[PDB]
């Protein structure tokens, strides 16, 4: 037997977006099973070269979780968006990230 | 109150050679160690990783944890390759220990296979998962018999050394562990929940400790309807939490958003909604 859990991701800034100051983009991807991910954070579709990430980890059902990051300036112009490919995914799957 | 320490394993199996290894150390949810696999050698995330321990000692238990690393791959692949149909599969272990309130310890070392739990290493015995049958119980057969001295070294591992360990670590790292970084708030407006139906949204980030207390309110009366976000992670060790709440239009006014955290020292955090009522 195998367990297969889809990925949870979740899209936050570090700081307000104050549009135009230095901030952080984070994208935590939890709960999925098994390890292999493909995790990417888009700035108008593109991906985003200098972009860091925590080392895998899991939680205590066994499934993983990480954390990318990537520091951005914030322009009205600019959308971003985080876009995981996983097992569980028959497409990736894409949740963009809302200024609130 | 408990304190934990655990060194986690993740071994992806892919084919009867290929196989990959992760490793990395934690105190409590901080990441204090990795595991660099090219050389095969234990990289100490913070100053105070080391924790106590001399060099001579981490440079022994970096060639234990080469040779634990050889054979375990070995011996799995030995048994996998008999049915290249299970492959890929997924090994993960939990191992370490934790200290409870009174000093007392307790040490675990628990193994997954494909997300679900194989066995567990209880008091002094390895005790197969209710849920695997053949695999769990071929494995504690194989574990409690013929590969033993791993037995005793698990044992003293996760109740002996883990402890004197997890206690250096914490005494190392005191400044750090023991710290308090107070949140920022901002409020914001999430997207309308309906027609004339307003949404305020509550961001607490970059705390720690991560225990935190958010709510919306009415002066005291807390509002039963806001709903509270998950206790997300920044890089940097700090944490984000969101609060909202849908309102009527007209009923916004007078609601703000309180946030308790240990490092506020007692004043805490209040900001009103104000939305385009200042001119
Ligand atoms: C600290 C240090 C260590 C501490 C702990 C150590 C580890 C702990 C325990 C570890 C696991 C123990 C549990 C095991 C339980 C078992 O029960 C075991 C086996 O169960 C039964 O076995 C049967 C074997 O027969 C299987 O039936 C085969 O299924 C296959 C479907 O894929 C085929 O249908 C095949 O048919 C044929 C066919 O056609 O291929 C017929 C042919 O006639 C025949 N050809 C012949 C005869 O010549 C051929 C033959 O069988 C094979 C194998 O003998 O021969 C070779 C060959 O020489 O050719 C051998 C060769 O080596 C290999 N090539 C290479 C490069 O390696 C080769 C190659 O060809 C294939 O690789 C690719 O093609 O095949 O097979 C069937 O036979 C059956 O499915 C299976 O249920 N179950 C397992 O899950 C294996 C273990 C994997 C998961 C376990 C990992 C997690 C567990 C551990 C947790 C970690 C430790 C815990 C704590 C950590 C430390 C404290
Ligand atoms: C093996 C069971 C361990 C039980 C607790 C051991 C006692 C703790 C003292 C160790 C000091 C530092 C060790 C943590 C860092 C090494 C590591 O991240 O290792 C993972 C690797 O091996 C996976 O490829
Ligand atoms: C075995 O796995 C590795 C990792 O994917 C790969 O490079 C190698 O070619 C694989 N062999 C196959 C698919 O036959
Ligand atoms: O303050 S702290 O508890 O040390 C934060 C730990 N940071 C990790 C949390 C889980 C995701 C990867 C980053």
């Known amino acids: ?100 | 109150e408990h304190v934990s320490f655990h060194v986690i394993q993740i071994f992806s199996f892919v084919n009867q050679s290929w196989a990959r290894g992760q490793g990395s150390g934690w105190l409590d949810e901080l990441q204090t160690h990795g595991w660099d696999s090219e050389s095969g050698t234990i990289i100490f995330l913070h100053q105070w990783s080391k924790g106590q321990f001399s060099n001579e000692e981490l440079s022994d238990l970096e060639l234990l944890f080469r040779f634990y690393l050889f054979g375990l791959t070995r011996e799995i692949q030995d048994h996998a390759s008999q049915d290249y149909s299970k492959y890929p599969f997924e090994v993960q272990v939990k191992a370490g220990c934790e200290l409870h309130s009174g000093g007392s310890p307790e040490g675990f070392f628990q193994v997954a296979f494909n997300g679900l739990d194989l066995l567990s290493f209880q008091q002094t015995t390895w005790v197969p998962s209710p849920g695997c049958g053949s695999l769990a119980q071929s494995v504690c057969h194989l574990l409690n018999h013929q590969y033993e001295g791993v037995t005793e070294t698990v044992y003293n591992l996760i109740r002996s050394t883990c402890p004197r360990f997890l206690l250096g670590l914490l005494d190392a790292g005191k400044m750090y562990v023991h710290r308090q970084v107070r949140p920022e708030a901002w409020l914001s407006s999430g997207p309308s929940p309906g027609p004339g139906r307003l949404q305020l949204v509550c961001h607490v980030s970059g705390f720690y400790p991560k225990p935190v207390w958010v709510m919306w309110m009415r002066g005291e009366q807390e509002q039963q309807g806001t709903q509270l976000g998950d206790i997300l992670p920044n890089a940097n060790g700090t944490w984000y939490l969101r609060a909202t709440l849908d309102v009527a239009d007209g009923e916004a006014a007078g609601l703000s958003c309180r946030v308790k955290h240990s490092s506020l020292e007692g004043q805490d955090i209040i900001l009103y909604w104000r939305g385009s009522l200042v001119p």
């Open chain 1, 1 to 100: 037997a195998a367990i297969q859990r889809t990925p949870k991701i979740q899209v936050y800034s570090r700081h307000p977006a104050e549009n135009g100051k230095s901030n952080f983009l984070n994208c935590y991807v939890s709960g999925f099973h098994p390890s292999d991910i493909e995790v990417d954070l888009l700035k108008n579709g593109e991906r985003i070269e200098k972009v860091e990430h925590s080392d895998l980890s899991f939680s205590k059902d066994w499934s993983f979780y990480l954390l990318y990051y990537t520091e951005f300036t914030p322009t009205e112009k600019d959308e971003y968006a985080c876009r995981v490919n996983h097992v569980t995914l028959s497409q990736p799957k894409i949740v963009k990230w809302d200024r609130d």
